Amino acid sequence: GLFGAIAGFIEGGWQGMVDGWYGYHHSNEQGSGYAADKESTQKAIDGVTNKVNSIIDKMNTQFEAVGREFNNLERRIENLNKKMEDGFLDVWTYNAELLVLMENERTLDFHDSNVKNLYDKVRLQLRDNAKELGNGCFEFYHKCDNECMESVRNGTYDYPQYSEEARLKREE
Amino acid sequence: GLFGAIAGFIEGGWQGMVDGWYGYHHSNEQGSGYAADKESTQKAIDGVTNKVNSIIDKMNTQFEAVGREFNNLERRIENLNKKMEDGFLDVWTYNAELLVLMENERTLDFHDSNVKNLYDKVRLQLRDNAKELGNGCFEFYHKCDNECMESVRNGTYDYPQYSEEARLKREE
Amino acid sequence: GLFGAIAGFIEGGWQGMVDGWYGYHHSNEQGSGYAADKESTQKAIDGVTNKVNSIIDKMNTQFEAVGREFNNLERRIENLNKKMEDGFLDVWTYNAELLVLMENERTLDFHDSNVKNLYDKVRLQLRDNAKELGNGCFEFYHKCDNECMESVRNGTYDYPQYSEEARLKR
Amino acid sequence: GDQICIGYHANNSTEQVDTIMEKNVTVTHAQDILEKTHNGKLCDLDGVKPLILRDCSVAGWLLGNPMCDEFINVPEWSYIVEKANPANDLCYPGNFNDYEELKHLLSRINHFEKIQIIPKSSWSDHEASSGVSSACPYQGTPSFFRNVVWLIKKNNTYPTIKRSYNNTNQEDLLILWGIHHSNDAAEQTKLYQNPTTYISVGTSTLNQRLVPKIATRSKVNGQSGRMDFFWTILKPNDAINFESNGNFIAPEYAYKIVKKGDSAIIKSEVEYGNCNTKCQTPIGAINSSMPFHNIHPLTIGECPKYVKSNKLVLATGLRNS
Amino acid sequence: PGDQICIGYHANNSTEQVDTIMEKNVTVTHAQDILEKTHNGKLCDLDGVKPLILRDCSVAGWLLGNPMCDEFINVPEWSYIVEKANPANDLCYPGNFNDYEELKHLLSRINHFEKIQIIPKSSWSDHEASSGVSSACPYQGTPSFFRNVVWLIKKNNTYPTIKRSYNNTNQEDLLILWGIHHSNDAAEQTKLYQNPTTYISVGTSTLNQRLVPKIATRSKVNGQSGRMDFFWTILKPNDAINFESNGNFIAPEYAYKIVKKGDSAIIKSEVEYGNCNTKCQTPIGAINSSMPFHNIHPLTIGECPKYVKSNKLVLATGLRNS
Amino acid sequence: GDQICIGYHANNSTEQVDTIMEKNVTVTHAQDILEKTHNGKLCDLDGVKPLILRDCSVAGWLLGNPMCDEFINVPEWSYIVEKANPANDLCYPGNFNDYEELKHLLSRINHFEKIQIIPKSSWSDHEASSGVSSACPYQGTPSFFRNVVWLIKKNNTYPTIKRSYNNTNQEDLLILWGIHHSNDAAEQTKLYQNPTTYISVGTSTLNQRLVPKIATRSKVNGQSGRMDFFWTILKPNDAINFESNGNFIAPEYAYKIVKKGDSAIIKSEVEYGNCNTKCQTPIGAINSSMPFHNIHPLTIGECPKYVKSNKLVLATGLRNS
Numbered sequence A, B: 001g002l003f004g005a006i007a008g009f010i011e012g013g014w015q016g017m018v019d020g021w022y023g024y025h026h027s028n029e030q031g032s033g034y035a036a037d038k039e040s041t042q043k044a045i046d047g048v049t050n051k052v053n054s055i056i057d058k059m060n061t062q063f064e065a066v067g068r069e070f071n072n073l074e075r076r077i078e079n080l081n082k083k084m085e086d087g088f089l090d091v092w093t094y095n096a097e098l099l100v101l102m103e104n105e106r107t108l109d110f111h112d113s114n115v116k117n118l119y120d121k122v123r124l125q126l127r128d129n130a131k132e133l134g135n136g137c138f139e140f141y142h143k144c145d146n147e148c149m150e151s152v153r154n155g156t157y158d159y160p161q162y163s164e165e166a167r168l169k170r171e172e
Numbered sequence C: 001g002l003f004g005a006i007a008g009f010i011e012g013g014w015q016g017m018v019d020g021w022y023g024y025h026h027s028n029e030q031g032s033g034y035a036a037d038k039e040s041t042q043k044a045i046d047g048v049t050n051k052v053n054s055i056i057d058k059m060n061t062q063f064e065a066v067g068r069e070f071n072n073l074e075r076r077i078e079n080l081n082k083k084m085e086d087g088f089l090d091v092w093t094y095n096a097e098l099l100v101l102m103e104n105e106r107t108l109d110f111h112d113s114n115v116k117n118l119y120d121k122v123r124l125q126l127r128d129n130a131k132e133l134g135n136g137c138f139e140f141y142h143k144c145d146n147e148c149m150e151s152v153r154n155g156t157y158d159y160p161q162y163s164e165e166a167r168l169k170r
Numbered sequence D, F: 001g002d003q004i005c006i007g008y009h010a011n012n013s014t015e016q017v018d019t020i021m022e023k024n025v026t027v028t029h030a031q032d033i034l035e036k037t038h039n040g041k042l043c044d045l046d047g048v049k050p051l052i053l054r055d056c057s058v059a060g061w062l063l064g065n066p067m068c069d070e071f072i073n074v075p076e077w078s079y080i081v082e083k084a085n086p087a088n089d090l091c092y093p094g095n096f097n098d099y100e101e102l103k104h105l106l107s108r109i110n111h112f113e114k115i116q117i118i119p120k121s122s123w124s125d126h127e128a129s130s131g132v133s134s135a136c137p138y139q140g141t142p143s144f145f146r147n148v149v150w151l152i153k154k155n156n157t158y159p160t161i162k163r164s165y166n167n168t169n170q171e172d173l174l175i176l177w178g179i180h181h182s183n184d185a186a187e188q189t190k191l192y193q194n195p196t197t198y199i200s201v202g203t204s205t206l207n208q209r210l211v212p213k214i215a216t217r218s219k220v221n222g223q224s225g226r227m228d229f230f231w232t233i234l235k236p237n238d239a240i241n242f243e244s245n246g247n248f249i250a251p252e253y254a255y256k257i258v259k260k261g262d263s264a265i266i267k268s269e270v271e272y273g274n275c276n277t278k279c280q281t282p283i284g285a286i287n288s289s290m291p292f293h294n295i296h297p298l299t300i301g302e303c304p305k306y307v308k309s310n311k312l313v314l315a316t317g318l319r320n321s
Numbered sequence E: 001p002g003d004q005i006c007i008g009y010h011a012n013n014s015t016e017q018v019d020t021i022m023e024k025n026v027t028v029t030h031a032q033d034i035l036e037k038t039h040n041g042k043l044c045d046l047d048g049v050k051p052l053i054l055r056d057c058s059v060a061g062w063l064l065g066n067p068m069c070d071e072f073i074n075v076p077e078w079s080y081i082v083e084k085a086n087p088a089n090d091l092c093y094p095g096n097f098n099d100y101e102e103l104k105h106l107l108s109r110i111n112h113f114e115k116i117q118i119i120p121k122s123s124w125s126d127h128e129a130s131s132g133v134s135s136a137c138p139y140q141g142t143p144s145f146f147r148n149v150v151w152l153i154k155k156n157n158t159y160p161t162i163k164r165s166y167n168n169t170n171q172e173d174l175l176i177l178w179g180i181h182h183s184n185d186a187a188e189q190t191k192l193y194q195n196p197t198t199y200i201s202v203g204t205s206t207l208n209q210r211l212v213p214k215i216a217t218r219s220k221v222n223g224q225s226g227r228m229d230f231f232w233t234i235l236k237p238n239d240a241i242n243f244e245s246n247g248n249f250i251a252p253e254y255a256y257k258i259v260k261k262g263d264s265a266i267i268k269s270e271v272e273y274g275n276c277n278t279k280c281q282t283p284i285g286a287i288n289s290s291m292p293f294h295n296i297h298p299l300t301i302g303e304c305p306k307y308v309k310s311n312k313l314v315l316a317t318g319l320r321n322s
């Protein structure tokens, strides 16, 4: 959508992931398996939970209609009562409906932004050390073990350590 | 703008572009011109129509403003009736205006994001075979003849095809 | 942060910078310190302000409540008149509270984007001439004195010059 | 080096829009959604012509003021037009009781059939004519509301009146009557014999007693006497029972409510248009397809939605240079 | 040439769609429905408190004691009141209930009455207390009358002037009802009361009423062409009410103690009881829900989801899967 | 090697904003737009002092309840202040008719000017100074409303009053009057002689007829007797016409309506503060350039807009570390 990640450079999602909303999938010699981003699947569930809770609270004080009766010589005021209560019911229906439409869109793009930002989080961590295929993936110039792939996620990453078999592997 | 493409890195728009909303400009020997992006323009006239239709749909219910008459000793209720209708016209006038005002800013940012997803798309396709001017432009490290230009615009661009030739100018 | 500049790719802000909202921190041959993008910040101060004025200006027309009295056999219309004044009070409170919330987010992301749209503007000028440290910084492959640095900020950094100094490390 | 650039559209447009953050932004494409235009004329509504009361009020009309003869029998209408201040309303000063509450009843009614529930002729112990006042001139000659009779003693005697009318019709039925307020004992004696007087009216719903207020008041249209008129809706198969011994202003004609449905009463000085429209406004009609309008708040028929702004333009295109 | 890492997102088998401004029907991973669309078409206790279901009586018919409502002569604390659109038992005898909607409105503010006897039917020594009844108000076939008010008649061809006071020596407010009888002609006036010129005055620190029968000829209704007009007052604790009349008086016998004020409601419903229980009620049925919104009906009583005019209202909680 | 970093501001701010997705975002700069502050005094409004009714109700003031005499010849006011339940309302119990309507007329009036219209001494065949009661004591001594006169029979007779007054001023004219209901036929005779009385008032507009209601009522202010006052607005060049043969509470002083404009009756227990203000609310005045306030829904003057919220700050600068 707006941040070109979900269904952007990345054309689809992964049926195979189920531990969380966003994450990484690794395909190395020492194994293969999926893994979820605890630190960023959490940030988003929290944010989206505030959305849902702030929308309900914002609405919990809308008009509350009340029955009122009038006699056949108060038809003017009965019609005034009527057009009033409908009018508010409409003002609050328009409110609810559109608040939902608006925040739905923002919620999607919020997921877009979250995915792209994750890609950049890693992309900056490796630089030249890995190649950008262009469809959501990083092709390691070297060989990364399972304690190294979980280091790109761990938060920091041994580039000075790994820089060595990277230039070496680059020339050819 | 807000994704820094329209009137951002790409200084201005092309008077010369008339077959769409966003497009490419190329220049090589056979020569140069404009070919508007097919799919990403359609994606916009599809998803902006809907926006303009969504606003006319979320607005068909409004306040039925009726005249009511009151006599000389009913000044209180009459004044309540006037205040009620003023109040309702005011609320819906706000609603209509703010909705427009917020979806205008949204729309603008939507075009601005559609361009930064086009540019980004080419950038990831081209890799190092080309130089990023930062103008919204790429100068090729090889020879791109038209079947090559339609290759960039197609999303069919073969990287290894011109890869060897590319790296020579990068060095010298 | 929606655009990721703040505060994802830059961990924290700058207690040290005062001249504006967004700027640069540079350590070089003569030392280190902060200078500010006087004109970038200014576009935001321009925009944020107009936005405030507009938000205020959508409310200058609102609902004004009135003291109306009723007697002991007019309890129905007294009731009606109460539910209608409360009715509008709730509606405009909803509108102001919600608008302030909605745009507060747009204003926070606004600053986020602004920053990213600056880091992009520097990355685009330097290119092969420096490392992307990845924390908001750049390690220069070459040596950079002030007209050189004050030039990346000017918006004009004559890249073709320093190109050879960088070729040497790689 | 060969080049490829990504860029966007720009054109000859000067259409503007606004933002919460920036005003008057020139854009390449826009859609104006606000209709700001109307003919300056009142017109038919779905091929049904309005009732245009000229200078009559509705009381003027339903009571039958002698200047209101234009509207003695009226065809089906879509809506009604009044001036803010019709000169022909009550030809003889007094009150129309529950007047606004009736006007409103009348705005759900598209047609009346006028009928004679009690013929003038049939007053035989009382004097039905004269009957008239200079406050109510017809062709310059003293007259009185047509749909109603100002009854007067005959041969110096006013025998108690007892009438009935029983509604043997399909439809509901609007009935008007009234009471004369004299100015002193003499006038009370000259017109009806009896010094102490009442009028009692009765239906299944109604049960009223009216006693004349014989006082002196200041002159209005030359008269300082008063007439208080009253109405009801007589259902099918109820009957209205009259009884009075003076000061009784009797119904002659009544109205069958024959077509109910959406109608309206609007104040406007604007001439008839001689056109047709689906949407109408006190200041002229609206033929639009826009979503919004800012013509007037009071509108009749299927219309754009009203809004108070002068400018409502939606951005459909990107920033322009 | 492998050893590659990838960044990506969740997907599942979900058809749950949401709408947005620029797009409709967008299947997403997870969503949260927020609209209650569903009700049990039955009226219930709220909560553990049964409503007052007037069946076919109106509120008028109930307070006056229309003989066909004896069912409600003694009645416990209620949560809300349920009246049909058109109760067939209102006033057995034709006429008027003065200030009826103002009284109806007081009721919505009241949870419990306590009928008491303020002027015993047996305290009318020099008038005829037990002979006023109508074939318009029938109980068990036999002619009867409203049970809370007494239609006094002349006793042995004489109707002396009445002067009864009653002192509210209770702690609570009293709803007091009384009436006037409009007869059809002098003859009938003569039959029921001797006196031809008649009045009714009622006093209280607040009330200052004078009523004179309009002896006149009216269309028959329920067989009766005469009329009764009723009137009511709240008599405060320590206040006192004085009646005075020489005929046409429909005296109080039973008046009601307002023992409990709360949030109630008269609602119009054709739907009937269900021995169930809820904490939110609607004219067309009840609501057990956790939603924040509902589209059942605009009128509710009790803790309720707020009302909206929408068929569909769902929050996109996940991302746009495929 | 040499380095350059891009970054952003962070100060010593402690200010919080809110968003749909997060509460309490501490922020670099934030403008507060909600006023939460009032000097809890009632003030002048743009240089005009309000009318502090102290313990008098509107009714006790216009009728002139003896205990209210501080309001005899009141100067221009900007708005009017009543307590919730004033003690001095009607000294002699009864009703004030169309009370709530009249008050509404006052929210549009800034100044009256009392003018004697029927002078006390002009009553020559009736008793002018005998109408006093302990229900309205003045300085201990039994007294009465100072703007109306309680007429008593003279020499055991009550000849039919006929007095007319014509409005020869430029201004609308507020006129009040009353009727007294006796307790029993005895009292009726003692006060007024005539067993059956009436008051009729007329104008071009008004056609009223009051008749006393005799009855037994609980004592209020040690009086079982009740008084119903009535009012009308007499337009210029029209005339009021009074007739009565008993129970009449005649007018003496009446109110020239000399200044119209925005005004208001507010109920407030708060005392004056000898201060000025552009904006005034029942719990206190507001001096504030904020767009919005928190204070009270009812305000008068040039004021911010009311909103129920307890916090309304707009984010201005960036998220803060």
Ligand SMILES: *[C@@H]1O[C@H](CO)[C@@H](O[C@@H]2O[C@H](CO)[C@@H](O)[C@H](O)[C@H]2NC(C)=O)[C@H](O)[C@H]1NC(C)=O
Pocket: D218, D219, F166, F167, F168, F237, F238, F239
């Ligand atoms: C009130 O008194 C005034 C004057 O005392 C009366 O006005 C006169 O009316 C006639 C026209 O009807 C003319 O002689 C003048 O136009 C009036 N007077 C002045 C001074 O211009 C008026 O008629 C009286 N109104 C009533 C109801 O008595």
Ligand SMILES: *[C@@H]1O[C@H](CO)[C@@H](O[C@@H]2O[C@H](CO)[C@@H](O)[C@H](O)[C@H]2NC(C)=O)[C@H](O)[C@H]1NC(C)=O
Pocket: E167, E168, E169, E238, E239, E240, E241, F218, F219
């Ligand atoms: C009804 O009766 C009560 C007492 O039985 C009256 O009570 C008056 O005032 C106080 C109230 O606490 C009593 O102590 C007094 O003894 C009572 N006054 C008199 C004169 O008896 C009450 O006023 C009576 N109702 C009316 C309308 O008088």
Ligand SMILES: *[C@@H]1O[C@H](CO)[C@@H](O)[C@H](O)[C@H]1NC(C)=O
Pocket: D023, D024
């Ligand atoms: C926008 O344009 C209108 C139309 O001429 C102009 O009058 C107004 O001042 C402009 N608003 C601003 C902020 O420039």
Ligand SMILES: *[C@@H]1O[C@H](CO)[C@@H](O)[C@H](O)[C@H]1NC(C)=O
Pocket: E024, E025
């Ligand atoms: C949404 O889906 C439904 C099928 O349940 C269909 O009725 C509707 O037309 C769709 N909406 C749009 C805008 O096409």
Ligand SMILES: *[C@@H]1O[C@H](CO)[C@@H](O)[C@H](O)[C@H]1NC(C)=O
Pocket: D166, D167, D168, D237, D238, D239, E219, E220
């Ligand atoms: C009205 O007339 C018809 C027969 O003429 C009948 O249904 C009904 O009995 C009559 N009712 C009255 C009140 O006269």
Ligand SMILES: *[C@@H]1O[C@H](CO)[C@@H](O)[C@H](O)[C@H]1NC(C)=O
Pocket: F023, F024
């Ligand atoms: C925001 O912070 C304040 C503490 O001053 C507190 O009153 C409020 O409950 C907080 N809200 C949330 C959602 O944490």
